[PDB]
PDB file of C-alpha atoms in Angstrom:
ATOM      1  CA  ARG A   1     113.567 145.392 105.463  1.00 20.03           C
ATOM      2  CA  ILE A   2     113.352 141.999 107.382  1.00 22.00           C
ATOM      3  CA  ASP A   3     110.276 141.991 109.314  1.00 20.87           C
ATOM      4  CA  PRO A   4     108.183 140.278 106.644  1.00 21.89           C
ATOM      5  CA  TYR A   5     110.612 137.561 106.472  1.00 21.08           C
ATOM      6  CA  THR A   6     110.188 136.857 110.208  1.00 21.12           C
ATOM      7  CA  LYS A   7     106.537 137.006 109.893  1.00 21.91           C
ATOM      8  CA  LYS A   8     106.317 134.536 107.080  1.00 22.88           C
ATOM      9  CA  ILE A   9     108.702 132.362 108.995  1.00 20.80           C
ATOM     10  CA  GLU A  10     106.408 132.322 112.068  1.00 19.83           C
ATOM     11  CA  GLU A  11     103.455 131.479 109.743  1.00 19.79           C
ATOM     12  CA  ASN A  12     105.175 128.666 108.107  1.00 15.52           C
ATOM     13  CA  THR A  13     106.168 127.331 111.614  1.00 20.21           C
ATOM     14  CA  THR A  14     102.812 127.463 112.992  1.00 23.07           C
ATOM     15  CA  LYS A  15     101.456 125.733 109.843  1.00 22.32           C
ATOM     16  CA  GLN A  16     103.940 122.942 110.350  1.00 23.16           C
ATOM     17  CA  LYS A  17     103.072 122.379 114.030  1.00 23.17           C
ATOM     18  CA  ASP A  18      99.471 122.170 113.201  1.00 23.26           C
ATOM     19  CA  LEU A  19     100.162 119.767 110.276  1.00 23.08           C
ATOM     20  CA  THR A  20     102.340 117.578 112.527  1.00 20.93           C
ATOM     21  CA  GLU A  21      99.653 117.385 115.195  1.00 20.41           C
ATOM     22  CA  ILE A  22      96.858 116.346 112.706  1.00 18.71           C
ATOM     23  CA  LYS A  23      99.433 114.001 111.315  1.00 19.14           C
ATOM     24  CA  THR A  24      99.798 112.221 114.595  1.00 18.40           C
ATOM     25  CA  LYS A  25      96.065 112.023 115.014  1.00 19.57           C
ATOM     26  CA  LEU A  26      95.672 110.638 111.551  1.00 17.72           C
ATOM     27  CA  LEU A  27      98.315 108.090 112.249  1.00 19.75           C
ATOM     28  CA  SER A  28      96.801 106.942 115.351  1.00 20.34           C
ATOM     29  CA  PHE A  29      93.373 106.531 113.584  1.00 21.61           C
ATOM     30  CA  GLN A  30      94.968 104.625 110.847  1.00 18.15           C
ATOM     31  CA  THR A  31      96.493 102.546 113.515  1.00 17.97           C
ATOM     32  CA  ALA A  32      93.188 101.823 115.069  1.00 20.00           C
ATOM     33  CA  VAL A  33      91.557 101.011 111.697  1.00 20.73           C
ATOM     34  CA  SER A  34      94.136  98.799 110.259  1.00 20.78           C
ATOM     35  CA  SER A  35      94.247  96.962 113.613  1.00 20.87           C
ATOM     36  CA  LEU A  36      90.402  96.313 113.601  1.00 19.54           C
ATOM     37  CA  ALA A  37      89.776  95.985 110.080  1.00 19.18           C
ATOM     38  CA  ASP A  38      90.601  92.397 109.714  1.00 21.29           C
ATOM     39  CA  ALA A  39      87.483  90.696 110.982  1.00 21.03           C
ATOM     40  CA  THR A  40      89.208  87.423 111.079  1.00 20.03           C
ATOM     41  CA  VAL A  41      90.784  88.474 114.407  1.00 22.14           C
ATOM     42  CA  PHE A  42      87.430  87.625 116.023  1.00 23.76           C
ATOM     43  CA  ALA A  43      88.112  83.928 116.038  1.00 25.97           C
ATOM     44  CA  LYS A  44      87.774  83.611 119.656  1.00 29.33           C
ATOM     45  CA  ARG A  45      85.560  80.902 121.102  1.00 29.71           C
ATOM     46  CA  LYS A  46      83.867  80.809 124.472  1.00 30.09           C
ATOM     47  CA  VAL A  47      82.750  77.569 126.331  1.00 30.23           C
ATOM     48  CA  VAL A  48      79.336  77.506 127.716  1.00 30.60           C
ATOM     49  CA  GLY A  49      76.657  75.080 128.487  1.00 30.79           C
ATOM     50  CA  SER A  50      74.648  73.413 131.306  1.00 33.74           C
ATOM     51  CA  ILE A  51      77.510  73.600 133.862  1.00 31.99           C
TER      52      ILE A  51
END
């Protein structure tokens, strides 16, 4: 009577674990992209010449 309930519970839990993992990965990637999307960050200047 109650085995299918357990099985579906385990299925959903596994699905949720996997979704959480891929969510963390997607968030890290979005962090990277949002950090390095503004090209204006490359305002650095370097001093060279005949020194």
